[PDB]
């Protein structure tokens, strides 16, 4: 480096200070503007209501076993075979014990028959948190009834739990009594239940699925409209969403059965691109 | 291949060397035996690589090194996708699209690097098919390819020379050495030693120069590629300049951008594996890194800017054989230039008339009747008579619709310039020649040196006798008594005696061949109209004539060459002349046409002025130099560089076709781009070696025209100044296009760089990037090519070949570190806004990619607690992809407006003045509209329809980018050269 006019690495010392100061101010300002624009963007969004609900507009549905690849295959002889399955159920259902629904400040008792959607609040910073409706475990008859082979969760002839994805400000509207939904219902109760009737995907398959029995609130095969709407996690603490058990006592063993459980509503839709929007997909095989 | 010729030796002395008899010829036995060792008499044709190899050679075309790795890794990831199944997969689709674009850009770069090495096309016309050889005392005509060193041949008049021949008998032989000198000025050949070196020894013929007249017996000294045209051909075809100076800059440019691609690829691959990622994950990271850095469309579009301006230059009569040639002109530094044909009209025409002891200037160009032809009106009235009467030259037929000067003539180079002069001045000289019928005829001889004719003037009544004699000026005063001034015939005096020689000496010192004219009206007393003049020089007098007038001929410069050379020199370009013509003509041509200034004096001029020895005076004080081809032999390469450096107005004369390459390589070893402008076979070897060669269209030999890179269709040396202008403009607009694509590449790269480190969900898919580079910016990228320079390029000097380059660290760090990062920050604002409107806040997106990409999870919670299905998250991810892609192009509308001007505000160039940049802006908006917010993005290609508010989220950063750019351009205008012009200029 020429000892003649400094110019280490091209440049003298004073100009070294000039260029680093320029780049520190360049990038510092550039970052100031980027985080600044982010903050002005975040002002528009409310902490309480999503600006848009375009994607989650059709509500999705998911099985509580939390199965790896849409599949449930086990041996009633081997405990480990279904060990992870029943563990996932127990983990989810821990929250619904009367044990946990103990505080009357945050938990209120909502009717044991379906009710009109409880409009608690308006989404403002007022009145603090909102009381969530209780859901008692016993309504999951024969599956986490707390006894009567509850602990097994139907180790033979399995049992799943159907859950409707939480969407904020969403009061679902069950289909009107236009015609027969499916088999002769004789189970109208139209206003306050989202009908959820598990069915056999494979029509050619003579639905070797066998008996299919749903355990709901007061024996109604749907979601009680009382719990809805959803005020968000911040407004509603541990909001216990409605849950519907399903016993599957199949007369077909060591054969894989594919079933699709659909939510029928005029406000609920389903799509062929999203096989977990409005629908299920369960492949259960009870190996020996 | 020997240039050690043998002209000193006598006939007896050579005949012992070549084992031949000058009269018995050679036995056909020794013909066979010598043909064996030496080979056939033929120029071996050049070696051209098959086009299939050149095409497939263009498949490692710089960027294709990284794109091959890209499609390799794509299919390698698909190999690992055999191990683990993936139905909806884009690594086969992406690998295919990549190989498609390697082959795509390859076939364009194939046309761009073109090489016409069709040199033998021109040489075949001149090579002779037959020879008049004599072997074993038997006259036979055989094919010239059978000749061998030292068999006798009988050169005939009007036939090409069969080989490089040394004459040993000659009777009025005159040959055409324009294939070595570029002049058709016949050099007559004796049979004896004239000069030391064999270029003009007057006793050796040359291969395939035409034999203008006479008969000469000779013995062949060299045959084949060792001949002088053989050596010219070896240099023109073998020294094939594949190196071009335009593509040395873009080759170095792909070196640096591939450099930065590779370096950040290993930086983030080692920090991938350090982050406990499987090599499969990290190599998908490398595929995205190289597709982000590589400017996909840059090189492809470049050849379209180049060929566009190639055909546009060709509509202005500048044919550009090689697409590269359009830049090679301009950013050039030294113009070595042939004179005749190129700087010269290559038509001997008259320029100066000396009558009444007074000097006059005439029409030299295609112009007509430009002179003070109205001074004496009586001396010039008879002077026209002697000019038109004393010529045997004639115009060829069918010339009623073709300009006078531009006409076909049969006759002598000297006589035909006077035919042209009399024909522009007096309408039909044939009329007055025919009228003033020529009764007496005189033969002409080479020793004669004068020509005379007696005509019976067809005046109605006068019908006297007029004798008119023209010839060398030396003879005229020797045989003249009464001069004429204004009709009256005044006798000569002591004054005019020396006056004639002094004027003549100064006129001939300007390279002008002088011819003097005298006449005499013979009295009717001695010779009436019945008296006839016998041709054997008995009846007419040869002394005591009447001097009419004097004139001179020069072969003038082309109409425009002086002014065009003025403008080249005034654009920082040193002009050198290189031609085969004697340095008396050359210096006058050179000082005329703007090559030598009027107060610049060679060593000759100063030694003549001071009347001191040339050894005494030094060298530096003379700013102009005239170096003969003969003193360049003894010249050493170090002192060729000495003089190239010391003086700036240098002309080389009587210079061998090999010394043209010697001088051009001498320039180029001084970091100087060179452009040699030529017309003849002697120029062709030095036309290849130039960084660009420029040939004359109609007035240029074929051999130069196939060696060239620009063929000037109308021999207009005024296309050079505009060719420089457009070349320097094309270079600056290439800088603009390049930096434009480079700055985008960063905002394409930052999403994957964050998605590897921070785990935010992929902000733009690797397949969507290709839509940016390959679709939206191809019309913007060509629309910058129509930009105009902020300041006149001519006011500035050429670029230094090495000192200032096409891409410099200032343009690179501006594009990558300044505008790329502002763009990517703008793109990420749209990313975070399109996630934060559906529930996923900024803060609560880190590390999510893992759960995000997990398809068993259909109930992911967002910041409002809603549950999300996989497919819904995947559609949102796609809307993040299109949000980010649209954001960057919106700031690419601003990028295109800042890149139009590298020096001053958009107001000064004018945003509206370029229409094509608005086609580019519109092309960008319309392609994104056809893509995202419309059909073709409903289910496909990582494309979703966008909320209308998402298009305009990126106008804040794209006003910011233009503002910041504009501010530094304002400050470089304001304070030039004070650390802002140095650190903040493209
Ligand atoms: C399921 O619940 C009903 C409740 O009345 C009970 O009668 C039935 O036995 C139960 N099934 C089994 C297998 O215990
Ligand atoms: F001036 Al030339 F060939 F045309 F030497
Ligand atoms: K790219
Ligand atoms: K060339």
Author numbering:
A (entry chain B): 17 to 304
B (entry chain A): 51 to 1036
Copy out sentences from the published article reporting this entry, exactly as the authors wrote them.
We co-expressed the rat ngHKA α subunit with the rat NKA β1 subunit in the HEK293S GnT1- cell line (see “Methods”). Purified proteins were crystallized in the presence of the phosphate analog AlF4, and either K+ or its congener Rb+. The K+-occluded E2-Pi state was solved at 3.3 Å resolution. The anomalous difference Fourier map calculated with the Rb+-bound crystal shows a unique strong peak overlapping the density at site II, unambiguously identifying this density as a bound K+. The occluded K+ is coordinated by surrounding oxygen atoms contributed by side-chain oxygens (Glu346, Asn795, Glu798, and Asp823) and main-chain carboxyl groups (Val341, Ala342, and Val344), giving a near-ideal valence (0.99). In contrast, the ngHKA has Met939, and the lack of a hydrogen-bond partner makes Asp827 face towards the ion-binding site, forming a salt bridge with Lys794 which now faces to the opposite side of TM6. Thus, the distinct cation-binding-site structures suggest that the ngHKA has evolved to produce smaller reductions in extracellular pH, as suggested by the higher pH observed in epithelia expressing this pump. This may reflect that the main physiological role of the ngHKA is to reabsorb K+5 instead of building H+ gradients. In the (K+)E2-Pi state of ngHKA, Asp945 forms a salt bridge with Arg949 (an interaction also observed in gHKA’s equivalent residues). Thus, Asp945’s side chain is neutralized and unavailable to interact with Na+ at site III.
